[PDB]
Amino acid sequence: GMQIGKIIKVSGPLVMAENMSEASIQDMCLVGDLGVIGEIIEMRQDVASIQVYEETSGIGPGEPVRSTGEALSVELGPGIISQMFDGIQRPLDTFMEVTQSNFLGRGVQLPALDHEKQWWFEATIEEGTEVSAGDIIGYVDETKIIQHKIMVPNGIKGTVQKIESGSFTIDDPICVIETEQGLKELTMMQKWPVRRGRPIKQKLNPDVPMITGQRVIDTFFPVTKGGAAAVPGPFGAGKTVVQHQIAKWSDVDLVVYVGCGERGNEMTDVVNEFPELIDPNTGESLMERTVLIANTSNMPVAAREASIYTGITIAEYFRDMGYDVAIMADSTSRWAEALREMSGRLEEMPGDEGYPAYLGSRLAEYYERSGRVIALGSDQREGSITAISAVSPS
Amino acid sequence: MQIGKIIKVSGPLVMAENMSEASIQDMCLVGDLGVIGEIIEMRQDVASIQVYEETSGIGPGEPVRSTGEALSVELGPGIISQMFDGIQRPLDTFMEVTQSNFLGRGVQLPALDHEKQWWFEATIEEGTEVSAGDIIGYVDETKIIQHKIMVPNGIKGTVQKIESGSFTIDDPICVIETEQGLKELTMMQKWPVRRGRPIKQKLNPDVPMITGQRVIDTFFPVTKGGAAAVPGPFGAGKTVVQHQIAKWSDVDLVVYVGCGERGNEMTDVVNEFPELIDPNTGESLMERTVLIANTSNMPVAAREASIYTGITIAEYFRDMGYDVAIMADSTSRWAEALREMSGRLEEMPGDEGYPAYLGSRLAEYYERSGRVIALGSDQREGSITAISAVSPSGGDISEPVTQNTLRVVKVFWGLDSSLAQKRHFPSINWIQSYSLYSTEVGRYMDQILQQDWSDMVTEGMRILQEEEQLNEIVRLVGIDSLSDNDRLTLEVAKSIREDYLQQNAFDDVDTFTSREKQFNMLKVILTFGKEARKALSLGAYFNEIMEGTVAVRERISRSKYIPEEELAKISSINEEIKE
Amino acid sequence: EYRTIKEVVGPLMAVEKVSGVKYEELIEVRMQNGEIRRGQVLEVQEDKAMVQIFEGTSGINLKNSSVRFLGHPLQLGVSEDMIGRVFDGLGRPKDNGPEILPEKYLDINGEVINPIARDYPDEFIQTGISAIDHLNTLVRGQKLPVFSGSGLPHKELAAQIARQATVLDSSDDFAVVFAAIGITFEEAEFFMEDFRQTGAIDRSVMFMNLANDPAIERIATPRMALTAAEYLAYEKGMHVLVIMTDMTNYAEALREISAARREVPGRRGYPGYLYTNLATLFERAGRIRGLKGSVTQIPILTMPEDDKTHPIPDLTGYITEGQIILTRELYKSGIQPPIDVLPSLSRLKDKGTGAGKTREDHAATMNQLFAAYAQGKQAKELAVVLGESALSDIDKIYAKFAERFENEYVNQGFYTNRTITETLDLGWELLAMLPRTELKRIKDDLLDKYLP
Amino acid sequence: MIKEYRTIKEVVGPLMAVEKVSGVKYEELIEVRMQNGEIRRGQVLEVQEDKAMVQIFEGTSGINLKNSSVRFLGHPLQLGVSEDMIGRVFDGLGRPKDNGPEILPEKYLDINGEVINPIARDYPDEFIQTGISAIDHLNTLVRGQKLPVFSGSGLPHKELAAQIARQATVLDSSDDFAVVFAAIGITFEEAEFFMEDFRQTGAIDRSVMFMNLANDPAIERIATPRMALTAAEYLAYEKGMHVLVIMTDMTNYAEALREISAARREVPGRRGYPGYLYTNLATLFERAGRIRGLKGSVTQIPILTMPEDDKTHPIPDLTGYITEGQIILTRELYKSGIQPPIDVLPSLSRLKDKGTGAGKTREDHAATMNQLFAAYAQGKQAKELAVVLGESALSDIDKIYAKFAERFENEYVNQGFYTNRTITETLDLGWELLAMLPRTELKRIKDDLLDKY
Amino acid sequence: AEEIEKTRRRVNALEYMTIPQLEETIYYIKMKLEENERAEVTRLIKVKNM
Numbered sequence A: 001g002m003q004i005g006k007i008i009k010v011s012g013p014l015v016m017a018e019n020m021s022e023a024s025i026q027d028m029c030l031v032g033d034l035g036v037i038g039e040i041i042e043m044r045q046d047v048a049s050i051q052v053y054e055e056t057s058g059i060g061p062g063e064p065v066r067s068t069g070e071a072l073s074v075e076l077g078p079g080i081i082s083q084m085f086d087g088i089q090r091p092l093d094t095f096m097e098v099t100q101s102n103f104l105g106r107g108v109q110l111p112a113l114d115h116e117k118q119w120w121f122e123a124t125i126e127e128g129t130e131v132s133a134g135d136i137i138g139y140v141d142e143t144k145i146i147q148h149k150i151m152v153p154n155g156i157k158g159t160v161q162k163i164e165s166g167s168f169t170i171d172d173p174i175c176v177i178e179t180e181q182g183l184k185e186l187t188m189m190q191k192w193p194v195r196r197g198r199p200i201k202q203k204l205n206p207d208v209p210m211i212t213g214q215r216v217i218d219t220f221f222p223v224t225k226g227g228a229a230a231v232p233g234p235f236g237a238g239k240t241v242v243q244h245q246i247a248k249w250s251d252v253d254l255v256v257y258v259g260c261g262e263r264g265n266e267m268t269d270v271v272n273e274f275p276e277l278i279d280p281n282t283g284e285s286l287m288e289r290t291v292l293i294a295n296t297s298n299m300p301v302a303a304r305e306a307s308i309y310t311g312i313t314i315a316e317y318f319r320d321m322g323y324d325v326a327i328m329a330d331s332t333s334r335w336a337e338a339l340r341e342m343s344g345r346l347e348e349m350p351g352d353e354g355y356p357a358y359l360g361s362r363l364a365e366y367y368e369r370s371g372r373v374i375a376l377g378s379d380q381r382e383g384s385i386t387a388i389s390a391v392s393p394s
Numbered sequence B: 001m002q003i004g005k006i007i008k009v010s011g012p013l014v015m016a017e018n019m020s021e022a023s024i025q026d027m028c029l030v031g032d033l034g035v036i037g038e039i040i041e042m043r044q045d046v047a048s049i050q051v052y053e054e055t056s057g058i059g060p061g062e063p064v065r066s067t068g069e070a071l072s073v074e075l076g077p078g079i080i081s082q083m084f085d086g087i088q089r090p091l092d093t094f095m096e097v098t099q100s101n102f103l104g105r106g107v108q109l110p111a112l113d114h115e116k117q118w119w120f121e122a123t124i125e126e127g128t129e130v131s132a133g134d135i136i137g138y139v140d141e142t143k144i145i146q147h148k149i150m151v152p153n154g155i156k157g158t159v160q161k162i163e164s165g166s167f168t169i170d171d172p173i174c175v176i177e178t179e180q181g182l183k184e185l186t187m188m189q190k191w192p193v194r195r196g197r198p199i200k201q202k203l204n205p206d207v208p209m210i211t212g213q214r215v216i217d218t219f220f221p222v223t224k225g226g227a228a229a230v231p232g233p234f235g236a237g238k239t240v241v242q243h244q245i246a247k248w249s250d251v252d253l254v255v256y257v258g259c260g261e262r263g264n265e266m267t268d269v270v271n272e273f274p275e276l277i278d279p280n281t282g283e284s285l286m287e288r289t290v291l292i293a294n295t296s297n298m299p300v301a302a303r304e305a306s307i308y309t310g311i312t313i314a315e316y317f318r319d320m321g322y323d324v325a326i327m328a329d330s331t332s333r334w335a336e337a338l339r340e341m342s343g344r345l346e347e348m349p350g351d352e353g354y355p356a357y358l359g360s361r362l363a364e365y366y367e368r369s370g371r372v373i374a375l376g377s378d379q380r381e382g383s384i385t386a387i388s389a390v391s392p393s394g395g396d397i398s399e400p401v402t403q404n405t406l407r408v409v410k411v412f413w414g415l416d417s418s419l420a421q422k423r424h425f426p427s428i429n430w431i432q433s434y435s436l437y438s439t440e441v442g443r444y445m446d447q448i449l450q451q452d453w454s455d456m457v458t459e460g461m462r463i464l465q466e467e468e469q470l471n472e473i474v475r476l477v478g479i480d481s482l483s484d485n486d487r488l489t490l491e492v493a494k495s496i497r498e499d500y501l502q503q504n505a506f507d508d509v510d511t512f513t514s515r516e517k518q519f520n521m522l523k524v525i526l527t528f529g530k531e532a533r534k535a536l537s538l539g540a541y542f543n544e545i546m547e548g549t550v551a552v553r554e555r556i557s558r559s560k561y562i563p564e565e566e567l568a569k570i571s572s573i574n575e576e577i578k579e
Numbered sequence C: 001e002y003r004t005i006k007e008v009v010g011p012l013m014a015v016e017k018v019s020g021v022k023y024e025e026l027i028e029v030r031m032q033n034g035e036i037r038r039g040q041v042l043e044v045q046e047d048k049a050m051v052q053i054f055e056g057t058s059g060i061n062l063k064n065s066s067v068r069f070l071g072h073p074l075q076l077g078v079s080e081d082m083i084g085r086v087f088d089g090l091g092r093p094k095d096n097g098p099e100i101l102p103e104k105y106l107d108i109n110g111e112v113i114n115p116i117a118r119d120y121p122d123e124f125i126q127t128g129i130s131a132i133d134h135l136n137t138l139v140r141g142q143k144l145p146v147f148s149g150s151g152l153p154h155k156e157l158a159a160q161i162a163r164q165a166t167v168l169d170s171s172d173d174f175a176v177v178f179a180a181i182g183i184t185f186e187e188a189e190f191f192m193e194d195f196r197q198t199g200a201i202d203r204s205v206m207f208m209n210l211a212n213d214p215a216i217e218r219i220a221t222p223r224m225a226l227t228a229a230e231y232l233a234y235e236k237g238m239h240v241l242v243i244m245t246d247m248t249n250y251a252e253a254l255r256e257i258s259a260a261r262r263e264v265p266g267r268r269g270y271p272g273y274l275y276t277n278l279a280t281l282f283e284r285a286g287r288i289r290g291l292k293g294s295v296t297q298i299p300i301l302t303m304p305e306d307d308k309t310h311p312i313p314d315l316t317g318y319i320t321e322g323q324i325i326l327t328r329e330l331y332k333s334g335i336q337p338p339i340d341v342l343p344s345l346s347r348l349k350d351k352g353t354g355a356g357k358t359r360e361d362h363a364a365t366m367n368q369l370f371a372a373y374a375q376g377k378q379a380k381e382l383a384v385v386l387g388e389s390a391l392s393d394i395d396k397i398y399a400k401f402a403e404r405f406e407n408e409y410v411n412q413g414f415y416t417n418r419t420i421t422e423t424l425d426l427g428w429e430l431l432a433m434l435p436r437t438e439l440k441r442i443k444d445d446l447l448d449k450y451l452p
Numbered sequence D: 001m002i003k004e005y006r007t008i009k010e011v012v013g014p015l016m017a018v019e020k021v022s023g024v025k026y027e028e029l030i031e032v033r034m035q036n037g038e039i040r041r042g043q044v045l046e047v048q049e050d051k052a053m054v055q056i057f058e059g060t061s062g063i064n065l066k067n068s069s070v071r072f073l074g075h076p077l078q079l080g081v082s083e084d085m086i087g088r089v090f091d092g093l094g095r096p097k098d099n100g101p102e103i104l105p106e107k108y109l110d111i112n113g114e115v116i117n118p119i120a121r122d123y124p125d126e127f128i129q130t131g132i133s134a135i136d137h138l139n140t141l142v143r144g145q146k147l148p149v150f151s152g153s154g155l156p157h158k159e160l161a162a163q164i165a166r167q168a169t170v171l172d173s174s175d176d177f178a179v180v181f182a183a184i185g186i187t188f189e190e191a192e193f194f195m196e197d198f199r200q201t202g203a204i205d206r207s208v209m210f211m212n213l214a215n216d217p218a219i220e221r222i223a224t225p226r227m228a229l230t231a232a233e234y235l236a237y238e239k240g241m242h243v244l245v246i247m248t249d250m251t252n253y254a255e256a257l258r259e260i261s262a263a264r265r266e267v268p269g270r271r272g273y274p275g276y277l278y279t280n281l282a283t284l285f286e287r288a289g290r291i292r293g294l295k296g297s298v299t300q301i302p303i304l305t306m307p308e309d310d311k312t313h314p315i316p317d318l319t320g321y322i323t324e325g326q327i328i329l330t331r332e333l334y335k336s337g338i339q340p341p342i343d344v345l346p347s348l349s350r351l352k353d354k355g356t357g358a359g360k361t362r363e364d365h366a367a368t369m370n371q372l373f374a375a376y377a378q379g380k381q382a383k384e385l386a387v388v389l390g391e392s393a394l395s396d397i398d399k400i401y402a403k404f405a406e407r408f409e410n411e412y413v414n415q416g417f418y419t420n421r422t423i424t425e426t427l428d429l430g431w432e433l434l435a436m437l438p439r440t441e442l443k444r445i446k447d448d449l450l451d452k453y
Numbered sequence E: 001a002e003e004i005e006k007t008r009r010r011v012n013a014l015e016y017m018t019i020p021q022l023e024e025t026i027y028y029i030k031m032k033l034e035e036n037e038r039a040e041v042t043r044l045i046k047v048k049n050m
């Protein structure tokens, strides 16, 4: 029931549309007849200004624009493991097979997770139990390595009325909660915006040393479970060599590799070499416990800007299951190049060396979401997020 | 018939309504005085008129009339040896009519003298298929330059009646039988300055030019049809090169354009030109020089016209098959005129406020020059050489004017202040300057004198490049630990700098260096550094070979002074340096 | 057809009473004298649309003029008969040859390559240059630019690489897509004369955009070339080499368009979306999984004031795998091509060089001659600071190495094609001056195999 | 009729907007009758539709809008020119300030002036003996020349200007110089000192002066220099006099135009200064030279204080691109007591080649001059090395030069603000400074000139 | 001892004059360029509002 607005003016990458009173600020929109990637920036009366992150050739006035009704979010549920996405969570493994092409066509929209695949839900809780946000009702063996634990989504308070195990898709209701606002059904799929982090009970001090397997790290320069490490990556220094040994030997549950913005052929490296890593405890591929983010330099700027904000939202989701997650950023110098580009398109006051003035606060927003926290729920399990970011100065 | 009414006057920007019949880029007579202007933009019935005269005392309500044609110039007999303003009005005739030494307002005078009588000698005969660019006759405007009257563009037919006699520029001298009808042709043709004269084909300039300057003709040469830029700070020598190049260029015509500079510069240029007698011709340099002058205190918008006026006059002469050299002193003032208008047009400024289309207009200017096959059945060869002077603030060549210029030109004569203050002239920075023609001119020069000139020039540049490497590592460290071999290179570079590069225009001798002199002096200094290398490799200390060669090293100093006839003096230094 | 001209400000004009107009849509002005001029949509509104005329607005009467909207942007009439034909910045013919019946009409924008669909470039490319093929190896499917400067011989090097580019033992000819962006007529004639005189035009498709042509014409010129290179490689399976120069004039054309829309610039007076603009063109390359064809892009840009922190080379280094840097000091000494290998790097050279690729000693001799030059260059400077007396017997050889490496290895000539075999053997001769104790990077198994 | 309106729109700083007007011309002098009787002059800057934006020279201080009026005069700002101007004191707008009789104007000339036809121009090759060896020998001053003096805050720029006008004359002639002075936003102490020197000399009566001090409104400083150059060319070409122009401080003039440039919300250029600064300074500097057929001449000696002592500042930079050379005063030479502290290395004169030589000054001036600078540059280069690497470390050949530059600063340049040395005494002194170096190191003097001297 | 003293003062000048003069010079150079581009984009925002 979203109100469709009509473009009144198109200039450069900026597109103006009226009849937009229903949409909220910073929402995503499908601009034009084609439906390109557009984010609401400012709105005056019923007219909203939308920065278009795809090419603007072929679009003009009269064409409609559909607001998604929400900010940049991620689908969180079974399927997300061992599947590659981009900065805005577009499944590349699905784009490849379904579209029958090797390109990302303008306006082509595909759901993030697999909404048709069957998963065996193993109900661990029975009816009549008081539940809140965070409590685990059951898990699905999504992958050979990980036990995806389905949790009660935020904002739901009531009594478990009816639950049953079996096999469902991520769009099928597996439980019913008798809330204060009436009876509500829960699915295995939950949406969450990449801009705001997932709530927690009490953040804790990262005092658990991590065993990376590398002697120079664990001895003299150790990172803790919930810490943060910055790594410069000059060419020839074996930056990818040190990365693979950390994502493989570290005592973590899930690895969330994030490619902010990278060179095409440099990215193909990561798409081919990262699955070739074997998990040491079982013998399967490292992809089983990894969620890869794939953004080249020619991706839309929204994908490069919210590249690290996407993976950290996935990390916080798996963190709330009690798992210890390591997130990898390579390279953050290209991520800031997306924020520097945003500050120019938005006509903002520049900070130091062209980067926006809110660069220090944006980095503060990211690295403050990682750490050893106590996830919500009665169990009070301790999750961990450790950030291993790479910098590449000019 | 439309009489426009002024609605706004903001400096040289005047806006007027009731203009719906007129078009863009049309000349106008603004105000009660009738000052000259031009439409630059058009919104509804209101037109923004870029006025080329002072707008003091003009308000809304005064009439404004269009002319129907764009800014054009009179290309015909009577242009040679004459100076005109930015709109090509004769300043000498301007003095005679107004009867005053000061510039007035609201007066329009034709460029050429339409009442002067010339002797048109007909060359073509009746009954010939003619087209644009074909020569039907000529008028000897001076002793050297044979002003050939050609068929203007857009006229294609058969000559029916033509004969020689004594006519004016207006008088019809020929009748062409075209498809449209019988057309009468005159000795004068009008042409828009903002439209370049067309050609048959654009050839590549590989015939170099003899300027007479040693640093120019050896390390940073310019070919007939090239584009050279001379950026530098004030007092560096930008105008000296323009004057000396014009005085000693082998070209058939010179178009010196003064743009936003000092009026006193134009005076000595007009006085000295008839005195610089060419001994091989008997005539002077004035009889091939066409002057255009719009000083700095004159209307700013006229600086745009002065640039497009001179390049248009150069195209009227290059269509005849004669090499023309156009001098733009200075381009910076033209660039200033744009920014000042762009600010009054509320346009988006670029770096330092310049309009974003600066690099476009610069590219649109220099691309007119070059070796070109003029229109016509004879396929005559014409060429225009652009020599521009840029005046960046504080010697900062990172400004958009110089940066956009170096993306379209091929030769860069960067002037240095540190050398100008040390009385080094011409103050051309050897490391900083360059020339894209240095490779092809080396191949030509290697053949004319039959000597490996391209590689002995490379050796001189290498020596000057090695000094800059030494001097920069030795400024702070000091030269006390300088190896004996390295010290020789320092004395080689010092000889190259003070003997060959340092040359004064005022002394009659250093002003011109011929191709035979430029070789002999180079042969002395290079063979010195090459054979004195063999002396230092004979177990010799540095101090010695110099002390015993001060007599040779002085004859090397006055090597520029040798008259052209007495060149054997220079070549005889090769044997005494060996002994 | 519309005869409603409201505003005309310079080469820009606005047309009211419009509907269904799109961005970058092609328009056509019908003047009062019958003259026809074309234009592109720089901005559309509901009641008006601004367009820039290519030929300009000189002499246009607003009241008696007309404008026709075509309803489609700049498309390329692509066909296989384009081989050997030279066009302009807008796809118009320039060689006055036979007309080409388009097989398809594709918009010059193109599509974004799926990063997981991208394949790894594995094949070596022999450019014939010792400084490139040995120390900064180009790979089939790599984005490797050439950082030059105003006055540096980048035109001679651009004519040499496209002339000497070949793949080993593949038995399929390399396809060359050359695109001159805003160059002068002289430099354009130098390129066209060199491709015709050597027979390389029989393998090439050239797009020629001059400097005096409109700014909107410069912006479409790379989009024209990459769309044809995309078609030759991905639709037909050819191996395509894309060469572009000068890249800086493409950025200045964006500034004239950006200022025409009254957009405030970003860093150093350039539009904010440049990173997206340059990456859109630079990432339309590489081998594709399931397709035999490949696109190899080699941009060429001149750095303003020879600054590496300038937005044009700073963002290019973030997008392209490596960079080839030319220096003004090497060119003024007589080193052709003046390619400095110390600041130049190749981010994919490791796969390009090895056994089966070139030879087993490619990676070892690269790392050996690399450190031998930096030590030889510092030794020559030590002879300037401390004199030749402080130089030992070993330092005198290192100073002799750098001097020969500058004059004999890199300085090969703009018309000298050196095979990979002749390149490596020359490096061994220059390395044969130093004793074995100096050569530490190379293992003695291969050091006792090739060292003379 | 009397064009006066009483419908004021708005008053913002020095600017002002009147509506419902008609017949208002551009650059039109106006008058503002307020509600108390005061009159303040101004000029029209823009006229569109029925509106007119003007600039008030004395500023808008305490102006009621409803009860004030604007009187348009229908002509640009003019100056009452007459020969009775000789020896008079006018303010920065033209009103006499010496409490004397009102001038009966022989004519009313537009302060904007007129452009001299370059064909009607006469090239100035005349020689002026300024009594200063650093000028007469190194950067020769000619009649009709555009030669400014660059200085800084606190430097003795006011002492040097009085010295030149006190000692200026021409060779083989008895003509006197009609000096024209213009104060632009300077302090009272600088102006009073200049007045006392002019009195002492006896040339005060000859000079015509316009006064704008620091406590005066800054807006009117835009017209004050145009007052002088209109009166200067009036006495030169029409009255047949040799006119000398000296103005200070030109720095305050540029600051005045930036205030209006900032008030008008124009598009700024370098450091907020307007983009047409090179043109606006050109309307003042190019009012100099000689005209063929007229016995008059206009010589200009501008004076400006370089902001932050930086030559790359827009004010001294654009001045050099217009004027023929410059004369630079450095704080380092004044630091050493050098009077005058003239730095002759960055200084230059461009009209001197035609003003020197046999028949004008000396046959060998050009060869000595060229030989001087080159050896001074290297001697200064060697001194800057002596103080860093030591006296003994310097080469013996360079060490002779190190003393060459020392005597060429304390004896040659340092001569005092009251020493009128002749051109013969200046050129003979120069050879005595070249006799130190051996004959072999004098390479830019020919043997013929080396032998005779 | 004499060559020791020449080198000694050579070294001393570099540490106390040449290198510090550059270090302070670079500071002022970088300072100017940033505020200049900072104030340059500032007016471009004001001109965009016209």
Ligand SMILES: Nc1ncnc2c1ncn2[C@@H]1O[C@H](COP(=O)(O)OP(=O)(O)O)[C@@H](O)[C@H]1O
Binding pocket: B232, B233, B234, B235, B236, B237, B238, B239, B240, B241, B425, B426, B427, B503, B504, B505, B506, D348, D349, D350, D351
């Ligand atoms: N080639 C030269 N030989 C001798 N003197 C020169 C030369 N070039 C410049 N100069 C000196 O520099 C002064 C200014 O030169 P000019 O070219 O007018 O400077 P600009 O760069 O302002 O045009 C001249 O008066 C002259 O004395």
Ligand code: ALF
Binding pocket: B233, B234, B235, B236, B238, B239, B261, B330, B391, D320, D321, D322, D323
């Ligand atoms: F004084 Al100039 F160019 F003539 F700086």
Ligand SMILES: [Mg+2]
Binding pocket: B238, B239, B240
């Ligand atoms: Mg000059």
